[PDB]
Amino acid sequence: QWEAGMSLLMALVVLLIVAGNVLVIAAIGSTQRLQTLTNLFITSLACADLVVGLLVVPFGATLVVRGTWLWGSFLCELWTSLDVLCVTASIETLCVIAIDRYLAITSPFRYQSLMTRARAKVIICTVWAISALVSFLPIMMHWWRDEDPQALKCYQDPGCCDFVTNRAYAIASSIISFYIPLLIMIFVALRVYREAKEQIRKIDRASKRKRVMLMREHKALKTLGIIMGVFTLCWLPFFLVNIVNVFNRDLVPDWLFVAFNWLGYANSAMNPIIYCRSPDFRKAFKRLLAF
Ligand SMILES: CC(C)(C)NC[C@H](O)COc1cccc2[nH]c(C#N)c(I)c12
Asked: Taking the C-alpha atoms of 262, 268, 273 and 274 in order, what is their torsion angle to the nearest 10 degrees?
């Protein structure tokens, strides 16, 4: 009856994710004070991370608990596609926010004259467009399938929903969906840690007006660096191992490959918790929870 002592932690984590992200969307949707530009991208994340809790985690939970896929050969690929999509759409939006805070911290004038709200919404959709094209289609077109006699065995089996992929895909799909966006995100997230350091460096002047607006605008930039940071810690392991197999299979235990995968799942619930650093958010979550 070990199944009962697991469905609790699983229903618990689904709760944290959903409740938490539904909260973050409401906090921004209600409070006009939280309806900033960057907080639109943050909304996108709250959605990607929500879809995970609502669909990706539930199904993925029954596959670990029962040890067998019970929802057919279709929902297998469909659940896989939503999974890959949500992770692609995330790293891309985090990569946007980096370039955003960069262009908004080095060209304050050009930024305001070019970056509106209706344009940033286009940006958000363009990201979800590329994410689908890149992750969703190649799966639908079965470019991931392997010719291995063992692999061909798992495709004809509806009860088996293992993501057995060839090595050509394994490499390209991980580069495109993760590594390239990650490197870009990291590089730019370091260029914004230098300018945001030189701004608080060449601040022996200013005032309790200009140092207060550099105390709020360095302070959010930290919360973003934490989001980008934690996210990397939860998904970089998984993708390192993912590549290891491409070079040398049977070197990493399958139980572990699933471990690091759930590590990256937990990352969806970690966001709303980190937003409690901001006084605004922290006050907005109390309004809704009826305190
Ligand atoms: C295997 C499964 C149970 C569904 N979990 C997949 C991960 O959530 C996401 O893994 C990825 C995310 C984004 C792009 C990716 N490319 C490849 C490959 N090869 C993977 I694995 C991958």
From this structure: 100
